[PDB]
Design a protein around this ligand. Structure first.
Ligand code: RF0
Length: 167
């Protein structure tokens, strides 16, 4: 048993809810929250900028030190940093940016990072401002992640569409 509430069970291990990941994280304080990041860990907008704003920019300060030491992430890669006031840990995961010409087949690689964590709160990767279709993103997730993933979908129209079109 875990503390995630009102989630709609989609498969053995994938759950979905119409919720803002920032508000979900603040309420649940999960072991792992996933950030949909970029290779530079530049959290200006979207999930990244919203989580970072919720940390009062502490996520960005920590991220800048990480990059100065280690250099950029790979598209499809990840790093574990602090969850600040939102979670124990933040798993920063880079899905492909299809508006940058980045291989959509790297989205599966992005979601493989989730398998290193038994339970995660996560958004849909590569959709929204990375240009890919949310319906496709949810499909890749279900077919790749084997650990227990709680998906917070911010847009109600999309959530209703993701559920209604789920095979
Ligand atoms: C489909 O992928 C992304 C997922 N994203 C979110 N998902 C879950 N919770 C979210 N809270 C937010 C607060 C914000 F200010 C901005 C975005 C979100 C958000 C919505 C959109 C962002 O571009 O697309």
């Amino acid at each position: 048993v875990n503390s995630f509430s009102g989630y709609l069970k989609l498969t053995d291990n994938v759950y979905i809810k119409n919720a803002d990941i920032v508000e979900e994280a603040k309420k649940v304080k999960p072991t792992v929250v996933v950030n949909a990041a970029n290779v530079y860990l530049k959290h200006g907008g979207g999930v990244a900028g919203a989580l970072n704003k919720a940390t009062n920019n502490a996520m960005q300060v920590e991220s800048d030190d990480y990059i100065a030491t280690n250099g950029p992430l790979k598209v499809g890669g990840s790093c574990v940093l602090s969850g600040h006031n939102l979670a124990k840990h933040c798993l920063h995961v880079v899905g492909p940016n299809v508006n940058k010409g980045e291989d959509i087949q790297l989205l599966k690689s992005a979601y493989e990072n989730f398998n290193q964590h038994e339970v995660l709160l996560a958004p849909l990767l590569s959709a929204g401002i990375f240009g890919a279709d949310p319906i496709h993103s949810l499909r890749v997730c279900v077919d790749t992640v084997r650990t227990n993933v709680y998906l917070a979908v911010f847009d109600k129209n999309l959530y209703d569409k993701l559920v209604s079109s789920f095979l």
